Amino acid sequence: TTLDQSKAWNRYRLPNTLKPDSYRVTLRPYLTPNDRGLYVFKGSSTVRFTCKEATDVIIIHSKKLNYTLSQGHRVVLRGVGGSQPPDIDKTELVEPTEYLVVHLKGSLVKDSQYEMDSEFEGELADDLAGFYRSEYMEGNVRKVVATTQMQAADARKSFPCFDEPAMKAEFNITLIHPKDLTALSNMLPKGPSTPLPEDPNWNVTEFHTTPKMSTYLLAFIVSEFDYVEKQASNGVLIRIWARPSAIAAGHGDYALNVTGPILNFFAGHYDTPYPLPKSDQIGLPDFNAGAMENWGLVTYRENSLLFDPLSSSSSNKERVVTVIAHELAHQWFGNLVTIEWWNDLWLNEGFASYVEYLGADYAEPTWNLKDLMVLNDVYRVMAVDALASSHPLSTPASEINTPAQISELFDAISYSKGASVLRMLSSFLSEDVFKQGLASYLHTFAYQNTIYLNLWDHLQEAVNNRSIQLPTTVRDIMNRWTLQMGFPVITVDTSTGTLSQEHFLLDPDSNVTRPSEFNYVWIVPITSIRDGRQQQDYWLIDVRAQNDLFSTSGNEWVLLNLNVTGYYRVNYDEENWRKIQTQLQRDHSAIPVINRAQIINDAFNLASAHKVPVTLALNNTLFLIEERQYMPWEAALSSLSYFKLMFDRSEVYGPMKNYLKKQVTPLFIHFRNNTNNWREIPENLMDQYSEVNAISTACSNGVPECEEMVSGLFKQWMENPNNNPIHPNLRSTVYCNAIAQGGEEEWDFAWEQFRNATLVNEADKLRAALACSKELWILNRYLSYTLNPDLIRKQDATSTIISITNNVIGQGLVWDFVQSNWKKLFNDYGSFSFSNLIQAVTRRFSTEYELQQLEQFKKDNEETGFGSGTRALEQALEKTKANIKWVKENKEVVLQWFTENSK
Ligand SMILES: *[C@@H]1O[C@H](CO)[C@@H](O[C@@H]2O[C@H](CO)[C@@H](O[C@@H]3O[C@H](CO[C@@H]4O[C@H](CO)[C@@H](O)[C@H](O)[C@@H]4O)[C@@H](O)[C@H](O[C@@H]4O[C@H](CO)[C@@H](O)[C@H](O)[C@@H]4O)[C@@H]3O)[C@H](O)[C@H]2NC(C)=O)[C@H](O)[C@H]1NC(C)=O
Ligand SMILES: *[C@@H]1O[C@H](CO)[C@@H](O[C@@H]2O[C@H](CO)[C@@H](O[C@@H]3O[C@H](CO[C@@H]4O[C@H](CO)[C@@H](O)[C@H](O)[C@@H]4O)[C@@H](O)[C@H](O)[C@@H]3O)[C@H](O)[C@H]2NC(C)=O)[C@H](O)[C@H]1NC(C)=O
Ligand SMILES: *[C@H]1O[C@H](CO)[C@@H](O[C@@H]2O[C@H](CO)[C@@H](O[C@@H]3O[C@H](CO[C@@H]4O[C@H](CO)[C@@H](O)[C@H](O)[C@@H]4O)[C@@H](O)[C@H](O)[C@@H]3O)[C@H](O)[C@H]2NC(C)=O)[C@H](O)[C@H]1NC(C)=O
Ligand SMILES: *[C@@H]1O[C@H](CO)[C@@H](O[C@@H]2O[C@H](CO)[C@@H](O[C@@H]3O[C@H](CO)[C@@H](O)[C@H](O)[C@@H]3O)[C@H](O)[C@H]2NC(C)=O)[C@H](O)[C@H]1NC(C)=O
Ligand SMILES: *[C@@H]1O[C@H](CO)[C@@H](O[C@@H]2O[C@H](CO)[C@@H](O)[C@H](O)[C@H]2NC(C)=O)[C@H](O)[C@H]1NC(C)=O
Ligand SMILES: *[C@@H]1O[C@H](CO)[C@@H](O[C@@H]2O[C@H](CO)[C@@H](O)[C@H](O)[C@H]2NC(C)=O)[C@H](O)[C@H]1NC(C)=O
Ligand SMILES: *[C@@H]1O[C@H](CO)[C@@H](O)[C@H](O)[C@H]1NC(C)=O
Ligand SMILES: *[C@@H]1O[C@H](CO)[C@@H](O)[C@H](O)[C@H]1NC(C)=O
Ligand SMILES: [Zn+2]
C-alpha cells in the first residue's frame, strides 16, 4: 500500500524546488450529458513558476483530469524572460499522491521562471468536489449549475496546480459558458460577457487577476441565478445571488442588509480594510458543506442564506447572520492571511467560529448573541473533549499528509474548542490588546502564510507594549491548551480557600492512554464573583493552591468562571453548593444568567463523572419554576435530554414528565398572559427562544392547556391552509405536537404542505414534525419514503431517519431497519452519513440486550465495512457500556427524586 518513498513523486508533500507565481485558467462546463451519459468540462491552463532549486522534474497536483496530448506529451514547457526549458522526457500520473509528473531531459536553472501549458478535460460529477455539478428542481424543470468546492485538496481536480495553501499565486480565470447564463468568480469581470466567436451559443467571461491567494479559495460558478446588490460607501460592491424566484420575492434581502455592517465591523476590528473589490455571496439549493469562504465568492447552503420574514423563524434569522459573519471573517483571517499547512486548521476555523458572534452582534446588537456561545460551542465541544478518545488542538505538521488525514481535522475540536480557547485568550488579555495583536499580525503577514506561533508572537508584543501582567509568556499559557487534549475541572474548597485541578473525564471508568507533555495540568485564568460582586482575577499555575479570594465565612458564597469565559468546569464543596442553591431560591437574578446555566450544566456533567451526587444536579433545577430567561432553561433541558434518552421507555419517565410539568407550567402561564394568548411574540430574542422552549416543554410533558392550543392552531391552519396562523417561531413545536396528538388527517395535511413547499425553512420543519406521529404504521410508511429521492432528497435522508428514531415508537422501528438492510444501505444509499445514523440509533441503549444486539451488528457486518461510521460504532459500544452502568446506579435515586419533587 506504500510506494517507493525515495522518489519525490511518491511523497504527499510537494517538493520545495518549484514555486508558482501566476496561473491562467480557462474552464468550459457542459451542462448536458454526452454519449457516455457524463457531464464534462473542458479546460486549458498555463502555470508560470519559479525554480527555487535546480531540478530535472516538474511535480504538480492533478486529480481525475484527462489531458490532450500536444507536441507528443501531456504538457508543453515554455521559457519566460529568456529562460530555456529542457526537453520533456516523459510525463506520468501518480494516483495515490495525485501528481502530474513531468520528467525533463535536463535541469531548470535556479531563480529562472518557466511556463507550463496544459489542455485537459474532467467530469462535472455530482460529487461536490472541485469543478462539479449541482442539480435542483425549478418547478417541473431540472436545472443544472456548474460550481466549485476546493477545500481542502480539490482545486487539482479542476486544473493542474501546486495545490497547497502556502503555494500562493495570482489567478487569471476565464469561464466559457452558455449564452444566457451568468458566470461568477473571485474577482469582477474585466468587461461584459462576450460571444464565443466559434459558437454564439456560448459566451466568454474573463475575470480580473486575483491577488496572491491559495488554490483552495478559488471559485467558479455558472448559473441562471439572479441577484440583489448594494454598494457600500468605501466602494465595495455587495451582491447576493440565489434562484431568480427566491430573489424576486426578496428572500435575499436580509442577508444583503447585514453584509455591509458585518464588513464594516471586521474592517475596524482588524484595522485593515476589506482586501477585495467586491463581495459575492451565493445560496445553493444543494450544498452539504454548509458554507465555504472562497475569496470574494462565498457559497452557502440555500436554507442558511435566504430568509423570509413571513415564514422563517428567529432561529432561521440568527442562522443567517452568524453564518455570514463566520465566512466574512475568513475574508481577512484565513484568506488574506492563510495557514501554512492544514495542521493549523483549528486556528483558522476556531477564530471564525469565535468572531462570528462578534460580527453578528454588530449587525444585531439587540440580540446578545455573544452569550449563546457557551451553549453552542463550549458545552458542545466539552461533551467530546471530556472523552479519552479526544485529540489535542494542534497537530505536528509532519503527521498531516494524506487527503484523508486533512479531512479528519474538520471536527468539533478544531471549530468549537478552537473558538472557546481563543475566546479565553481574548479574555485574560484585554480584548483591546488582543485586537492590537490581531492588527499587527494581519498587516505583517498579509498575502502570506503563518503558523499559530506567529499570532502568539504578535500577541506577546501587544502584551509587552501594553504592560499586561501574566504568569508567564503567551506561548507557555496557550501550550497547555493546544498541545494536550481535554480540559480541567477546578474543585473549590470554600472553607480553606484552596483550588484544585485535574483532567476532567465524563466516564468514571475512562482509560486515557494518550500521553501529555504537562501530564494534564493547565495554567488557567480564574474570574470569580462573591455575593454578585466580581472579585480580583487569579491564575492557577499548579495542581493545587490557596487564595483568600476563594474563602468564605457565614452566609457568603463564591462562584468561579464569570460568564464561562474559561475552558474549564467548576466543582464546589457541599457547603458552597447549598448557599448557591439558596441564592437561586431567594433571588436567582443575583447570579449572572450564563452562570445559572453553568451551575446546571456543570452539575449534570460532574454527576456522570461521579464527582457529585446525581441528586445535586437535579436540585440545581428546582429554581427553574421561577426562571424566565432562555439560557438556564436550555442548559437544563439539554442535560435532561440524556435522562429522557435513558428513561423514556421505563417507569422512570412518568415522574420525570410530572416534574418537568411542574417546573414549566408557571412559565407557560406567564407567556400565555405575556403574549396576550399567543397573539404576539416577545421583542427580545432570548425571550422569544424562552417562550418556544416553554411551549415545547409544556406540551411534551403533558400540560393540558398547551396540548389543546397547539392542536387548535393546527386545525385552524388545516381550515385556512394558505393563511398559516402559526407564528414561525412556534411552527416546529406546534407542527410536531399536533401531528403527535392527531392521526392520519393531520399527517397527510402536513405531508402535502411538505411536498408543495417552496420555502426550504418551512419544508425542514415539516420533515422533522412528520416524524412525531404516534402511529407506528405511519412512521413505518414514512421510513420507506426517506430512501426515495422523489419524496425525500438524499441530503435530507439521514436527518429524516434520525428524526424518526428520536420518537420512542420509531426507535425500535429504525433500529430494526438498520440491522435488517445495512448491507443494502452501505451499497445503495456517496456521502450518506452512516456516522450520524449509528450514533442516533444507539443513543437510547442502556441494557445488556441492546449491547449484545450491537455487538452482533458489528460481527454480522464484518467483511462489509462501516466506512465513515466505523468510528461511531466503537464509540457507541463504549457509550452503551457506560449507559448500562449509569442506569443501574441512578435508576432508583432518580425515580425517587422525580417522585418527591413532582408534588
Ligand atoms: C495574469 O494576468 C496578469 C495581469 O494582466 C498578467 O500580467 C501582465 O502580463 C502582461 C503580458 O506579459 C504584461 O504586459 C507587459 O508589461 C510590460 C511592462 O511591465 C511593467 O509592469 C509593472 C507591473 O508589474 C508596471 O508597474 C509597469 O508600469 C509596467 O507595466 C511591458 O513592457 C510589456 O511590453 C509589451 O510586450 C509585448 C510582447 O509581445 C508587446 O507585444 C507589446 O507591444 C509591449 O511591448 C507588456 O505590456 C503586464 O505588465 C502584466 N501585468 C501586471 C500588472 O503584472 C499575467 O501575465 C497573467 N498570468 C498568466 C500566467 O497569464
Ligand atoms: C477520464 O479518464 C478516466 C479513466 O479512463 C475516466 O474514468 C472512467 O469513467 C468511466 C465512465 O465513463 C468508468 O466506466 C465504468 O462504467 C460502468 C458502467 O457503464 C458501463 O459502460 C460500459 C461501456 O463503456 C459497458 O460495457 C458496461 O456494461 C457498463 O454499462 C460502471 O460499472 C463502472 O463503475 C464505471 O463507471 C471507468 O471506470 C472510469 N475509469 C477509471 C479507471 O477511472 C473518465 O470518465 C474520463 N473523464 C472524462 C471527462 O471522460
Ligand atoms: C436536594 O438534596 C436532596 C435530594 O433528595 C434533598 O434531601 C431531602 O430533603 C428532604 C427535606 O424534607 C428530606 O425529607 C425528610 O425525610 C424524613 C424521613 O426520611 C425519609 O424516610 C423515608 C422512609 O420512611 C425514605 O423513603 C426517604 O428517603 C427519607 O429518608 C421526613 O421526616 C421529612 O420529610 C424530612 O424532611 C428527604 O429525606 C431528603 N431526601 C433524601 C436524602 O432522601 C434536599 O432537600 C434537596 N435540596 C434542595 C431542596 O435544594
Ligand atoms: C433590508 O433593509 C431595508 C432598508 O432599510 C429595509 O427596508 C426598509 O424597512 C423599513 C422598516 O420596515 C421601512 O421603514 C418604513 O419607512 C416608512 C417611511 O418611508 C414609514 O412610514 C414606515 O413606518 C416604516 O418605518 C422602509 O420603508 C424600508 N425601506 C425600503 C428601501 O423599502 C428592509 O426591511 C430590510 N429587510 C429585511 C428583511 O431585513
Ligand atoms: C452573451 O453575449 C450576448 C451577445 O453579446 C449578450 O447579449 C446581449 O445582452 C444585452 C443585455 O441583456 C442585450 O441588451 C443585447 O441586446 C445583447 N446583444 C446581442 C443581442 O448581441 C448576452 O448578454 C451575454 N450573456 C450574458 C452573460 O449576459
Ligand atoms: C457577563 O455577561 C453578561 C451577559 O450575559 C454581560 O451583561 C451585558 O453587559 C453588556 C456590556 O456592554 C451590557 O450592555 C448588557 O446590558 C448586559 N446584558 C445584560 C442583560 O445584563 C456582562 O457584561 C458580563 N459580565 C462580565 C463583567 O463579564
Ligand atoms: C508601545 O509601547 C511602548 C512602551 O512600552 C511605547 O513605544 C508606546 O506606548 C507603544 N508604541 C509603540 C508601538 O512602540
Ligand atoms: C400542490 O400543488 C398542486 C398544484 O397547484 C396542487 O394540484 C396540489 O393539490 C397541491 N397539493 C396540496 C394538496 O397541497
Ligand atoms: Zn470557517
Numbering used by the authors: 63 to 891, 894 to 967
Which text from the study accompanies this structure?
These structures identified three distinct APN conformations, based on active site accessibility, which we termed closed, intermediate and open forms.
The human and pig APN ectodomains share 79% residue identity, domain architecture and dimerization. As the N-terminal and middle portions of the hAPN and pAPN ectodomains are heavily glycosylated, we produced them in CHO cells. The hAPN structure adopts an intermediate conformation in the crystals; the distance between the N terminus of each monomer in the dimer is 116 Å, and the angle difference of domain II with the closed conformation is ~6°. The phenylalanine adopted a distinct conformation in the intermediate and open APN conformations. The TGEV (transmissible gastroenteritis coronavirus) spike does not bind hAPN because it lacks the N-linked glycan recognized by porcine CoV in pAPN1516.
